[PDB]
């Protein structure tokens, strides 16, 4: 990325964090 | 058998759900068959006016 703006960069395809329990187990206990 | 008394409704219902487990996987991305169009949508010409 020779551009001076950080949004000019290529796609960031390395975000492997998940949390399925905010949709599958949204119960309090 | 489904055994109900006389004051219960004699026809009962099941609701079937399906999910995937956490060993589930998908690959080789393609377009979906579930949507399509043969014409333009309404007011899509108004975006050019």
């Amino acid at each position: 990325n020779f551009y001076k703006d950080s949004y000019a960069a290529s796609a960031s395809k390395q975000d492997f964090s998940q949390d399925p329990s905010k949709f599958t187990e949204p119960v309090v206990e | 058998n489904l055994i109900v008394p006389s004051e219960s409704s004699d026809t009962c219902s099941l609701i079937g759900f399906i999910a995937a487990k956490d060993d589930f996987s998908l690959r080789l991305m393609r377009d979906s068959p579930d949507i399509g169009q043969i014409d333009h949508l309404h007011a899509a010409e108004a975006a050019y006016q």
Partner: protein, 237 residues
């Protein structure tokens, strides 16, 4: 252990004896707006026990040809109590909600309710290309009725509406459902009279049926705002 529940907010309290485990939406709990996310610079009012309390809407009759009911938040509360007075006198609001839905019948009744809280439920109209007007969306305290609940009145699907924070009232199992909603907006605060953020939908997926005597079964909705802030004090409109 997860079937009895007491929800004490303000001077209000709800006990229930046939509950499920309650739902915290997206694993989140309501809070006040922190300083690193604040935008409006004036000091907000936080009328804690005056507004963070249950407000009970009018009960709806649960029948054979029922399609479903919906209330939009905060539009269903903008005229009720000290929440409604703080809404009308201020420009900005921010709150979560604690929705409790009540519906009971006998052990000879059957029926299932999908009690689902939908974020940003932009509705659609059927068989036309004119957008839904102001009176078709802003029903107020009484709420609306689903026209086509099988598609959630927006071309989507009722079958996949369990991706949203939801519970069930299966009359075999429980008689109440509880959803705890956080602040759900792309904005920190919002103008409450022109934007609704949560729609509580209550839908007959399995209809009401029995062969014993036909009493009226109603469905009652108690909604508690949680962690209300208000900015932009002015006159009431």
């Amino acid at each position: 252990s997860d079937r009895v529940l007491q929800l004490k907010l303000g001077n209000s309290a709800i006990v229930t004896q046939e509950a499920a485990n309650y739902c915290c939406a997206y694993g989140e709990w309501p809070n006040y707006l922190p300083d690193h996310e604040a935008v409006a610079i004036d000091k907000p009012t936080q009328p804690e026990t005056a507004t963070d309390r249950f407000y009970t809407l009018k009960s709806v009759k649960w029948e054979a040809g029922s399609t479903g009911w919906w209330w939009k938040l905060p539009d269903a509360l903008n005229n009720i109590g000290m929440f409604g007075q703080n809404v009308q006198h201020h420009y900005l609001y921010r709150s979560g909600f604690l929705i409790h839905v009540q519906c009971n019948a006998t052990r000879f009744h059957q029926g299932a309710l999908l009690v689902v809280a939908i974020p940003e439920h932009q509705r659609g109209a059927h068989n036309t290309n004119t957008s839904p007007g102001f009176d078709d969306i802003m029903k107020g305290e009484e709420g609306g009725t689903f026209n086509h609940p099988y598609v959630l009145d927006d071309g989507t699907s009722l079958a996949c509406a369990t991706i949203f924070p939801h519970q069930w009232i299966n009359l075999r199992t429980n008689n109440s459902a509880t959803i705890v909603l956080p602040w759900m907006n792309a904005a920190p605060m919002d103008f409450p009279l022109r934007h609704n953020q949560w729609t509580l939908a209550i839908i007959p997926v399995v209809p009401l049926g029995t062969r014993t005597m036909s009493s009226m079964v109603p469905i009652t909705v108690s909604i508690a705002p949680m962690c209300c802030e208000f900015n932009g004090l002015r006159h009431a409109i």
